Amino acid sequence: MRVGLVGWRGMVGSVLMQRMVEERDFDLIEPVFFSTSQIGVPAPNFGKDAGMLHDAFDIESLKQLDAVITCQGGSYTEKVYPALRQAGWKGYWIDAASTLRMDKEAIITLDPVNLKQILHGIHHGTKTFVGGNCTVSLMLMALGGLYERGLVEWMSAMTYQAASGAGAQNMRELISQMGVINDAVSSELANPASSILDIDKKVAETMRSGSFPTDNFGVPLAGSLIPWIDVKRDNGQSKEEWKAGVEANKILGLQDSPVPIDGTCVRIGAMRCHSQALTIKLKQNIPLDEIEEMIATHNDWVKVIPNERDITARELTPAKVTGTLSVPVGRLRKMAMGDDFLNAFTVGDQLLWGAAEPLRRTLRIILAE
Amino acid sequence: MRVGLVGWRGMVGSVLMQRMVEERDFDLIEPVFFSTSQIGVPAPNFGKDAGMLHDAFDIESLKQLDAVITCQGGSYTEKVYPALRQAGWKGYWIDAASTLRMDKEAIITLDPVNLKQILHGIHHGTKTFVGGNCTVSLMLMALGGLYERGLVEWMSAMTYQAASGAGAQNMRELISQMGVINDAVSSELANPASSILDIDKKVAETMRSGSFPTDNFGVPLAGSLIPWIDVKRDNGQSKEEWKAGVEANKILGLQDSPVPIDGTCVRIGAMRCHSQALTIKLKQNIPLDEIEEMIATHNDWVKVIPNERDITARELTPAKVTGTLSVPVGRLRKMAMGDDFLNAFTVGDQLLWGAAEPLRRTLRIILAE
């Protein structure tokens, strides 16, 4: 199989390349590397020679491929995808971008949750497979066991989203902001006799100053939070908030009778893990033990953490999860509202299950069929 | 009125002192400053001479006071309060600590919500007045207009709690951790062409290292979060999560038919403002405009932030709110679950309405009555 790679040098693409090397995906394909900047020079060698860099915008070149995996983003997909399909290309388009998620000819791919749907699509002529929104994918990796059994009546999701969701430049800005905050008080910070209110005064002033680095976020992130992600929609949701309901229900094949999913999506000062605090309304009163089993046995990556302070502090955090494929879920308990209300808190890596991992897995599924 | 001040040198105490100076509270009282480790040293001069620092554990000296305002904490109250009351002291005990909050003889004070309850207490022999949990006070300052009208069926609260809530050393530690994170990658950040994954790897290693300053939190906070605050309770709640239900219903005088309040309390890398993401179940489908009016008209400090992207990012954040008495609430909209589900996101300063402000206001109410 001849597989084109686009956006392999960017953040998501570089994670994908790392994972494809780790899993020896390249052993099974003929990789063709494309560039949006410079062509004709040697392609990256991740273990074997792959020839030259090809023109990412050349329709004839793309037409010769059996598949494309693109992490290049929405602008690229919009520019290339329609023309490529119009030109008669029937190969597999595997895409990280949101562009095609809700297209009638596309399947959103999260195989631990919807392998059956993916396989049906492959067998019946679906050629476009799109990774879902990071928060959606991470939530379903945590709660797939409940959703697959049709037990969720509705879910409120309040999120704690990392800088990586916005981009590499945003991550850099977050760290720079952290440095500027510390710089303001570093001389007196470690002196317990120094006025804590004077320290706070300087921190607040620094964060409010015009020179505080906020080009990417627009406002401070370090030391703060931003309770709005992406553009406004007419009903008052942000696009980030709206994505959950439409995408999860497409993944789950419930568009005719969707699970209402809503809440507030908040950016916080984390690098690359999204966390989510969930109010889950269940259709029945299920014992907590059974809920724990349903969740834990759904997939190999979900990890149900005992509901205890010390273990939670150590295991259920971005510090623990960053750069791993593990999806811990904890604080699992019935709520004051009733035995059909379930609290959950989950953490997941935005770049792995939330971006790169479903792309390589989809490739492997297509190969095996 | 002779008023004793205990724990005035600490963080909440320092904020209280600043506020009492700003509002000229000292003009109305005879302040007597107490101490644990500086007995005999001249008392602070905030405008007038207050003599010398008295012994905070001497019951005989405390008995000469008409009132005590204590920011000293739970262990101090546990030791001094029973002994002082048993000695026959009939003065006013105004306390920030959680200790006496649920005692039958005590009133939880948040006068923009329960002035009437406080006044009735004063006129009927109540001599113990206790500030509520920071999260409870801040939530009710935002949503008092709905709660006082009995329109809330239940509420799920997912919190984003500032470092200051854990203590002054914890806030310092947060800033310290920010510095350590930046230090690890400062060279790479200054280079435009550095790899984001290399930067990410170093940040994660730094956060996980024994050298990372985690003495107070036990785990990283900067770059992370901690979805557990305070001790575990038998039903799986943390103490922090349990406080909202018992305290809010006491404040509102709803013990006979309490509003269910529950959720997950999470520590994040914010300086001194708590933020809360609320799923509010209403007993009726109230028009959104009317909800906003009910919220806005409740008190002088709540601020309805229009549900627009740019204004939300600028106004509904710790960076905006820090060190002010403003309690913005925004993202006000009906949710996917139905028009009797209200989303709300609110931010409030932990040290003001969440700690010091109800104490000085209670003093002023007692003085005026």
Swiss-Prot record, chains A, B:
Phosphate binds at residues 101, 243. Inhibited by S-methyl-L-cysteine sulfoxide in vitro, via the formation of a covalently bound cysteine at the active site Cys-134. It catalyses: L-aspartate 4-semialdehyde + phosphate + NADP(+) = 4-phospho-L-aspartate + NADPH + H(+). Pathway: Amino-acid biosynthesis; L-lysine biosynthesis via DAP pathway; (S)-tetrahydrodipicolinate from L-aspartate: step 2/4; Amino-acid biosynthesis; L-methionine biosynthesis via de novo pathway; L-homoserine from L-aspartate: step 2/3; Amino-acid biosynthesis; L-threonine biosynthesis; L-threonine from L-aspartate: step 2/5. Signal peptide: none annotated. GO terms for biological process: 'de novo' L-methionine biosynthetic process; diaminopimelate biosynthetic process; isoleucine biosynthetic process; lysine biosynthetic process via diaminopimelate; threonine biosynthetic process. SUPFAM superfamilies: Glyceraldehyde-3-phosphate dehydrogenase-like, C-terminal domain, NAD(P)-binding Rossmann-fold domains. CDD domains: ASADH_C_bac_like (cd23938), VcASADH1_like_N (cd02314). NADP(+) binds at residues 9-12, 36-37, 72, 164-165, 192, 350. Substrate binds at residues 161, 240, 267. Belongs to the aspartate-semialdehyde dehydrogenase family. Homodimer. This is Aspartate-semialdehyde dehydrogenase 1.
